[PDB]
Structures are given as structure tokens and as C-alpha cells.
Symmetry: C3
Subunit: 271 residues, 3 copies
């Protein structure tokens, strides 16, 4: 399915099952297919599951402009309104934690029953003057430099720390191939602009707007989005938030810890 965003960008989405809606927002250099197992799992157990390809990724159009969290958050508002969704549970992975958060911050929680943050960049990823513990901006400047020379090899090399293969996680060549294949569908522009977006956007104001039950899940072996300065802090900043830490789990834990995640999501939805 597709809908057309305010600026005319066509966004691809899947809308599966029937029942209370669960809307998934993918990570960086991925697309809606990253969620296929969670979607099948929940939609087979009486839920409606929705997942979109962020502008510039997967099967969506690739605009030059609007590759920023305010627009990502309004793309989500437009999807929710296109489907007239109610009592939605929002699930964001990695950079996708940011746009579900920003959606709540910009539009309020009237349509939202709950929030899940998975290996998420929230509440802030990069360094700020009052957050020297964040990731130094040099690190992200280097992602960009490498992407603007050879994004295909950057993606391939990124699989190892993403999935924690270099620290004894076991992920098949098939998954690594599918990950590269989907990432190559994305716009070069959107891939680079997203670095800018997740490196510098401060979601701490958003945390205080979150007035719905929230579950934060993060792997403490995450080599991409450090648990100590993201998930751990998000869980303290969001009122009433629950935190689950997957022991030694990598960033790419929706694959390495799929069954555990499916079960925790179902548990949260049934709370």
C-alpha cells in the first residue's frame, strides 16, 4: 500500500491483520521488512500490524528535502490519519524510536495506547554541551564521509557490529545478504541525512510529553546505539516506563533475540 505525504512523497506501507493496531518504525538503512517476523507473530495472534518504509528507504519515494525528524513524525501522523488509527501501540527501533517519540511530542497521544522503544536513539544519541557522554560528532562525520565514498561497502561492513557477529552472535549469510539488499534500495541522500538527524536531534523534551505506558528494550552489548546513554536514560526520563535489558544482546536483536522480543511485545500488549 502507499499514501502520499504533504510534500507529495509516496510512502510504502503494509497493513496486516485485524484488531488493535500496532505501528512499527524501522531503524537506519533498513525498511519495513525488518519487522516481518514481529508482524506475522502478532497478526496471527489477533492484532493489526502496520509498518512503513521511511521516506528515502525501501519501496518509498526518495525526496531531496524533508529528511528530518519533524517531517518523519508528520509522515507518521499522516499514515495514522490515512488509516484513521485508534489506540495504536507505537514501536520504534533504533533511529525509528525517534520519529514515534517526535510524533507524540508534535501531535499528542490521543490516538496512542502505548509506546515501545527498541535499541532506540532516544533520548539523545550524539554529544551536546550538557551531554558529553553522548557519541562524539566526529563518529557521525565519519559515517557520512564513508557513505559518500562507498555506501554499499559501508553497509556490508556495518553488518558485523550491527548484529554483534564480531562478538560471537550467530547470524546467517542469508540475513546478511537480505540486510544489504534492502539497504541498497535506499537513497544515498536519505541515508546521509538520517545520520545528521539521529546524530543531533534532542528528544529529551519529547520524553516529558510521553504520557502512555512505555516499554524500553535494549541490548547491553549494543555496539551501535550505546545502552548506557540511550535506552537506560529514556527509561528513567519517561514517567512509568518499564525497562528490559537483553543480556549481551547486539543492536540487531530483533533478529538475534526474535522469539524473546515477540513474546515481550505480546506481553506488553496484553498488560
Amino acid at each position: 500500500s502507499t499514501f502520499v505525504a504533504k510534500d507529495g512523497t509516496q510512502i510504502y506501507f503494509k497493513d496486516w491483520g485485524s484488531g488493535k493496531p500496532v505501528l512499527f518504525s524501522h531503524g537506519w538503512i533498513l525498511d519495513a521488512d525488518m519487522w516481518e517476523y514481529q508482524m506475522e507473530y502478532l497478526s496471527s495472534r489477533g492484532y493489526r500490524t502496520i509498518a512503513f518504509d521511511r521516506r528515502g528507504f525501501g519501496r518509498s519515494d526518495q525526496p531531496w528535502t524533508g529528511n528530518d525528524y519533524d517531517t518523519f513524525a508528520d509522515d507518521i501522523a499522516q499514515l495514522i490519519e490515512h488509516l484513521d488509527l485508534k489506540e495504536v501501540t507505537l514501536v520504534g527501533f533504533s533511529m525509528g524510536g525517534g520519529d514515534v517519540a517526535r510524533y507524540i511530542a508534535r501531535h499528542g497521544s490521543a490516538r496512542v495506547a502505548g509506546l515501545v522503544l527498541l535499541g532506540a536513539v532516544t533520548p539523545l544519541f550524539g554529544q551536546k554541551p550538557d551531554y558529553p557522554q553522548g557519541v562524539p560528532l566526529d563518529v557521525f562525520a565519519r559515517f557520512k564521509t564513508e557513505l559518500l565514498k562507498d555506501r554499499a561497502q559501508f553497509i556490508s561492513d556495518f553488518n558485523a557490529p550491527f548484529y554483534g557477529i564480531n562478538k560471537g552472535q550467530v547470524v546467517s549469510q542469508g540475513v546478511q545478504t537480505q540486510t544489504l539488499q534492502i539497504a541498497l534500495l535506499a537513497s544515498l541522500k536519505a541515508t546521509v541525512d538520517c545520520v545528521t538527524a539521529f546524530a543531533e536531534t534532542d528528544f529529551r523534551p519529547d520524553m516529558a510529553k510521553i504520557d502512555v505506558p512505555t516499554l524500553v528494550i535494549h541490548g547491553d552489548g549494543d555496539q551501535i546505539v550505546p545502552f548506557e546513554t540511550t535506552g537506560k536514560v529514556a527509561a528513567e526520563l519517561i514517567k512509568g516506563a518499564e525497562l528490559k535489558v537483553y543480556k549481551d544482546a547486539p543492536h540487531g536483536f530483533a533478529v538475534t533475540h526474535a522469539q524473546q522480543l515477540n513474546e515481550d511485545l505480546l506481553a506488553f500488549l496484553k498488560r
Copy 2:
């Protein structure tokens, strides 16, 4: 090209050349590109060739519902209607043998000149009470179990027994890579639902409704769809059906025996 099915599912198809129409229905984790060499072969020789991506596969939309043979068969009826095809030769490979059989059973053969069943699951694939010789439903349960853990590696491992590379067939890395790339386009949901469909759907009633010239071709080294309990029996159950057995040919014989197949299809059309 695309048309929209009754439930709103957008279906991708190609329509090449001019003349009497030949309509192709692809096998399981594949899409319309599996037929590209037969399409080029016949369309350069005075035929019009049409092939679609089944719902949930390739470039088609991925509905949660309708992943069953009555719907697949009605999808084909809608394609035929959309293009207003007359005197069509239907060609089904593997699970696609089932939806062209079911189309004729559901809609009659007034628009149909002929039928070709290639490595096809017809007349019945899995066991029934009067069909213990079928494939045991636990084999299909295991496909599903592995798909629901890691479909990408499942597809990659499927190449060897699909093409018979484990039994001395020679297929390039390029073809193996293309097979995996197309398979990853598909929906996880449709991939698993098709197992249920081809495992349990009985096309024996359908065979009695086939009243057009029919050619059945099967490899007797087919490791995926056993010749003895499928193609051999379909050729006996369809009145006037002709049978060709490709000696030691694997399941993926549209690749390994491409030239022979082209020539057999051309000879059938020129009967």
C-alpha cells in the same frame, strides 16, 4: 504493468508481444522473472506472453488475507478479464500449476485454448486419507518452522535441491543470486501461507474439469515435487493429456533444460 484485484491488492504483470496469448503462473518463492527466457523465446516467434507476480511475491502488494488457491485463481480470472484475453494457453510451474488448474475449475475454459503443467503440484501434493503416498504434512510443517526463524537462509539452502546442484546439475552463482534476490522481495506471510495452500489443497476434482489440450512436463529427478505422485498422475487424470518426462531433470528445469522447454512449448502451441 499493474491491475487492482477485488480486495485492493495491486498485482504486477508483464505483457509482451502480439498474437495468441500464453499466460504464465510462477512457482513458490519466485516471481514473473522466472519465465523471462520462455517469454522472450515465444514473443520473438509470434506469440503474446503474459506473466504476473502472484500476490505477496515480487513486485505485487503483500496482503495478509487471500493467500489461498480460490483467490489465486480469481486473481488470474481478473488478469484475463483486465486484458480481455481469448484462446489463452495457461502455463503453471510448481505451485503455479495449481492456480491455473483452479482457474479452469472455478471459471470454465471458454477463454482457454490449452494447459501446460510444469513440475506441478497437481493433482495433490501432501497426504490425504486416500493419498498416503503424498508428502507427509510434517515435511511442510518443518518448512514453515524454518521460514518463521530465518526465511533468507531457508531460500539460500533451497537453491541446491531446487536446481539439483547436489546431484550434478550445473547452475551459475549468478542464477542462484538472482533466485535469492527475487525470493527476498516476497512477503514472509505469503511465503508461509503458500506452504499451507500447496500442502493441503486437492486438485483432483479440478483435473476432471480440464477439457482442453494439456501437456504435462516433469523432471523425474525432481527433489521438491515428486514426479511419481504429481505430474505422473495429473497426466492420467486429465483426459487426452500428453506427458513428457525430462530424464534426471530437477525441479528448476526451466533453468537447467531451458532450450528443451522452449522448444516443447513452441511445438505444443503449433499443434
Copy 3:
């Protein structure tokens, strides 16, 4: 973005940034993504960049008919008129040199500010009776023969002389994988018809019609489109054309010599 050609073929394109327009025409078995670094480079520097997938390639539809240079030139004409582009700089790589030349020959240059021919098949590629220095036509017949047996492995094997990997150039596995992935999106029919087109089409008449500033760039280690009988001659035949020869550069020099190309495009635009 998409537009629909006169004959109903949907053609995919990207339209990035704002300012004076620069429209890119890709080579053979590639798509608009081959331009992504040049597009980002220029659109970040005050230009509008447009690139389309040639009919039968990448994300465009796959028509059986119209796979010839006159039609390719008319697709470009419709895109330009569709967007109402003025003072456009046309940039063609390899076989895409021919369709931007043919656009000017067929439609004149009222909308055109400048022309860039990169590793281009212009002014003619294959042998003719007055051009025995051209590539013998049996070389192309053999391309076609191999394509009609196994295009996936042909593409895979083509990467080495395309990028000059067999001759001192260094290109990552990621880039080779992305090249193959994009190439497999294309139509078998379009891939083969394009060989006929670039093998046999004479653009020498077109050269005398080019009445705008023109830059020819070619690698002199080009194993696919030999500099001496193409780019070298094109720069002599077009009045006032500038020639830059990249030393030891292969055919795939938008990859191996990306920065140099970016800077030369920018210099040409600002001349």
C-alpha cells in the same frame, strides 16, 4: 517519481534539489542509482539533478516494444517537457550518451544549455563499411547469445572489465554486489535490445546537430567502449567540444574516478 510515456510505459526518475537542471542518462544494465554520488554532489552545491531509469531498466516498466534510440530520445523529450526544464545540461554515460545526443538531433537544443558525454558510445560503436575500426558486430552477437542463456552470470562476469578490476583498478565487493542487484531488476528483453541499439546506431549525423557547449570525458583504459573510436572522434566531430581523457581510467569511471568527475562536472557547469 514516475511519468507515463506515450505508449503507456511508466518511467521512474528522481528529481533532487533546485537551481539550473542537470539530467543524467545511465549506461547499459545500470539504472539511475549509478548517478547518486554526482547527484548529491551537485544538488548540495546549488543545482537541480534529475536521473531516470531507462524503459526496461531498474524501477521502470518493461515494454516489449520501443527499445531503440529514437524512442529513448523521445522518453527524454517527454521528461524534459513534463518538468518544463530550461537550460538543462544533459549528461550521458556509455549507451546513455546516444540517447541525449539523439534527443538533441530529434528535438533541437532550445531547452539545452550544455552536453557531457562520459565513456560514451558516440558517435558510433560497432563496425560499418566506412568504419572498420568500430567493434566487429559478432562481438555483440556473442553478448546476445550469452545474455539469452544466462544474463545473471553475464552481468556478474561483466563487472571485471567494466570496472577494470582485471587491469589494476580497485572496486569493493559492495559495489560489485550493488551493480549486479540493479542489473537484475532490468528486463531480459530490454537488456538484449539495447545491444542491438548501441551496436548498430550511427550517431555521426547527430554530432553535426550538437550546437551547445560540450565536454567529452573518457578513460583511456576503457575495455567496453574504446576511447580511440568513440570519445576521441566525438570530441572532433562536435564543434567547439572540450575533451578530457582520464589516464588509465576504466569504463566504470563514475565509480573509480568519482571525485575527479564530480569536480569536472561542477567546473563545466560554472564555465
